[model samples]
Target: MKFTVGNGQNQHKGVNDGFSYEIWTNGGEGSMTLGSGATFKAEWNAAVNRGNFLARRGLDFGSQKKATDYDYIGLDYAATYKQTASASGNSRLCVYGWFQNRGLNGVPLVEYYIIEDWVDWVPDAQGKMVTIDGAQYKIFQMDHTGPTINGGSETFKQYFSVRQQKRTSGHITVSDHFKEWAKQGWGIGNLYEVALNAEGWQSSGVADVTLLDVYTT
Candidate 1:
């Protein structure tokens, strides 16, 4: 896959064009706060479409029992945000994860399944400084997942129209599985959300709310 950086001038190299995967952890943004001895693992992919906006698919794995527990997973999609307010009040960000049930080694198992999604709010910055939607957003996996598995497998798809609001913020709704699980008395896994005020721009506070991962080829 090839990604065009602003005005399609700088063509950054990309993973396979069809679908690629990645894992993300709590880093920048205080949105995701892991409990004592808790960790999260996830996988996501992107699909190319000639006419419509590109589509995305993902899965999240959460476990308190070590790196292999692989407790829960979900599915999701990326949609377009039609900003109705010039004040930037209509900006929205969403993320997702998908899952399905399959037989593994003769045992019924729930794998990443199909698709899972999640979303978060990011506030726009003021002045000439780079705004939330203006800067390049990178996705990465943050964990001790092991060798042959760095954060490079992660895939990032940019949406030029995806912007953040100014002040108010919270978690973006995921897939129906999450909602169904929450209704069944099982606490759905965590989805991190952060909104940066214009005043917090360029401060450590900003770094505290964003994902920290080095982009690789």
Candidate 2:
């Protein structure tokens, strides 16, 4: 005897493309809220050849309020670039982040540390490192700052950039240091400012500035 399975209402009759996998869901309730008196600004840094990078400041809630909750503050950023030239070359991307508690006092909180920093390259016809002139790459980092502890003045900073190249697309990246910081009992609540620094295309320009996104838990 032989058995067969039908396509079921022409479902599998069309182009049965393969499956695509991604880290879409992490099994947790994540939410964001915007508070009043929140704003972001950027300033150019001509000396370093970097671009002024900034993200809209906002508040995020995690699952719990414990050392293992992984709940903390967060930010999101996006930008656009208009290509001007094209050539065979390499581009570099970097990201860094830090945080502080302003309402309390001037106490420093440290969370998450840099492990590795390098560029991701694509191969060309001759097996050479080819730059995706009009492409973008995003880097993200996050950690929980521990339970609702007590402390004062805390500050965080991050820096990133892409190498010189013409006809290149906007670069993207995120940094989250709440978990690790929470584990260390850093207390990243009542954040004051989140700043970013970026540079692109040698002899092009640089951008730098501070951002504020704070709220009550």
Candidate 3:
């Protein structure tokens, strides 16, 4: 497939610090190179605090939201992919999201992680081990506070599971994962945003992924 490269521009909305919100973009936002059938590469330069992505928008940070006029209330997804990245960069082929909820220190917008590759940093696995689609993952819950995310000193609860081993493809039962979190006292609330993207830092590689489906039942 042909790729569409972005010029690394950001579209900001709402207030900052007191109103950090809406659209900060990147150069190669959405385009990947093909290695073969169902195989491709998505690469980015030394871009920091910027993402190359395609995502659900309008759900700003430090804000409140509901499904509103939308039809779905939760996220469910499946995909098959292979990660091609250096072990020294903060990059990964993962399913990610942020939502309006009261879980991470009263923070309304809680970021959720379905999968991630800590490339070079070999992060600690902090949660219980569980299997999803026959793959094992170490799930965790934590708070990440940062000053560079369009908002001033923004912090949110992050819930995610990292794979114990690499796989070429698999299915992710998102809501089921949430159910497991709920068993741990994690709270889930109004939908804000959900995205499947590669988070990279000073990195280069490809996420030849086939996003099978996204839905709510």
Candidate 4:
């Protein structure tokens, strides 16, 4: 659903900043056409790349709170993804996310990557390598340095995980890795914002992925 700001009927999270649940997508140039049952089909004619009354609700704990406040925290959640599309040469599409503090600046944000497509990030990965629910991924300690909305450059430490494989279809338990981190005191921070993003760096062609209607809790 192509939603706009200040539309009382569309209070759901989206590309707009400062929301509990948001689809902060970034792409070069593309158009997406929505469909029923939370299903959407997108096509990038040249360069690139949520919600409504019919939007699929993504599980989120929007407010900034201690991880302990969650119902038994740790790596222990599952999800199913269904992707159907094709692309190549400077084009890729994947599911992305972030766990942050202020949910705005670069202060205290932990990032996670579930890349499920073509060649995008060259794994300059560090830290531990773990396997969750079969698929393997190399976790990394990274950060993003960008100027704040007001002024000075802000750097946010990102606790990121990238899928070792590039396959774009299946089921995964995304939370199982936190235990490994929590043990070492590496990526432990208050969970602020959780997002499902589709990013196209400098990509083209039609590439789209869809999250299943429901997750097996």
Candidate 5:
């Protein structure tokens, strides 16, 4: 079936096919479809600033457990997409997500992006490099002060694993990335959600998430 969103600061999230999907846009026109054979598709256009169209299935607020609580956190996905940026090249499209501690034990919330693929113009690599799921990725760390998932404006650290080669189909061993982060002395807090996001910023795009499955094993 297909779900659509109009232009505005609209946000929606719910469960689908045993997974949770979110459609959020500061200002854009987009649509999400849960097709037969478990294929997922999303299209976005006229995105004024930031937007997220993706699928997720994991721990959330109030019920979040530590990442170590799970045996393995990962996803098996094969995706393809196309996008365009504005003249000034101020746009982004990638697969990423966030994990927040929700002020638990007063730990600062963390937002991390494991960018498996993108359109163009990702943050320049600023940290070390690591190999995960047979791919090379450059790490980046930054502090962002803005409105957060827990609400209220606050400064939080952001992490990025920008893949060197863009691939549309692969397996993401999410836990391995967590392990690398911990090795780097970055704290991995309680979970919020581990969603493979198709994000667009100041751009227009469409994606065919041909296969997506999140599981712990």
Candidate 6:
């Protein structure tokens, strides 16, 4: 199925075979193709110098769980992207998600990323090195104060597990990342959401993805 969203911002959410899917963008012209078994293709052309475009499938909003609630959160995917002229060099291709504190342990909200590939700029300056699933990653934490998922101007922390080497296909044991982050003494609240993200900043791009599976066991 092809979705042609010509220009500007757009958002959509739905369910297929017990999996939740979402398409989001702030400023871009794009289309998405939803395929069998949680696979999708997202193609976008940035309308300006900065924009966000992505399609993700997983737990969202009402279906959220705690970080400790799941024995494992795993993902299998064959993902790839091609791009042109990243003006700011901040654009990225990543696994994005949110974690809400729910006032548990006085922790704040968290925005996190597991980057598999990137355009040019890499976020390696603010991280510590760690290895998982036979791959090396730079784990980092940063603070941000801005509009949040609950719809308010609030402060939060951002976490990242950036792979040392870029790849287009792999199995990611997502839960291992959470456990590793927790070991860093960073606060990881309840699970709010997790999904594949094709994000662009001042750049035009195309991302083709086949999510073989995204499951919790």
In order, what lDDT does every prediction score?
A: 0.22, 0.25, 0.49, 0.43, 0.68, 0.76
Candidate that would win on TM-score: 6
**Model 6 poorest ten-residue lDDT run:** 56-65
Clashing residue pairs, backbone N/CA/C < 3 A, model 4: 29-48, 75-175, 75-176, 111-159
How many times do residue backbones clash in model 4?
4
Candidate 3 error regions (>4 Å):
1-41, 47-87, 102-108, 116-118, 122-125, 147-151
What TM-score fits each model? 0.22, 0.26, 0.62, 0.62, 0.85, 0.89
Worst 10 residues of 4 by lDDT: 48-57
Better of 1 and 5 by lDDT: 5
Higher-scoring candidate on lDDT, 4 or 5: 5
lDDT of the structure predicted as candidate 3? 0.49
Error of 5 at 164 (Å): 0.6
* lDDT per residue (tens digit) for residues 1-217 in model 5: 7677764536667776656677766656777777543357887774454543443333233336666566797777777777764423233334445666765675557887888777657777469889898889888778999988778898998888888898777888888877887788776777666767776666677778877766777
What is the per-residue lDDT of model 3 for residues 67-86, given as tens digits with 9 covering 90 to 100?
Answer: 23233334333334332443
| TM-score pick, better of 4 and 5 | 5
Instruction: Order the candidate numbers by lDDT, best to worst.
Output: 6, 5, 3, 4, 2, 1
lDDT of 4 at 108: 54
Residue 81 lDDT (model 2): 23
lDDT of 5: 0.68
Residue 48, model 6: Cα distance from true site in angstroms:
2.1
lDDT of 6: 0.76
Q: Write the per-residue lDDT of candidate 4 for residues 12-111, one digit (tens) a residue.
A: 3533222223222232234444443334444432232211111112335554664434443322112232223324324333333455555444335555
Kindly indicate the candidate among 3 and 6 with the higher TM-score: 6
Candidate 4: segments with Cα more than 4 A from true spot = 1-27, 36-38, 45-58, 67-95, 103-107, 147-153, 210-217
* Residue 163 accuracy (lDDT) in model 4: 71
Instruction: Give the residue spans of candidate 1 off by over 4 A.
Output: 1-51, 55-92, 104-182, 185-217
Better of 1 and 6 by lDDT: 6
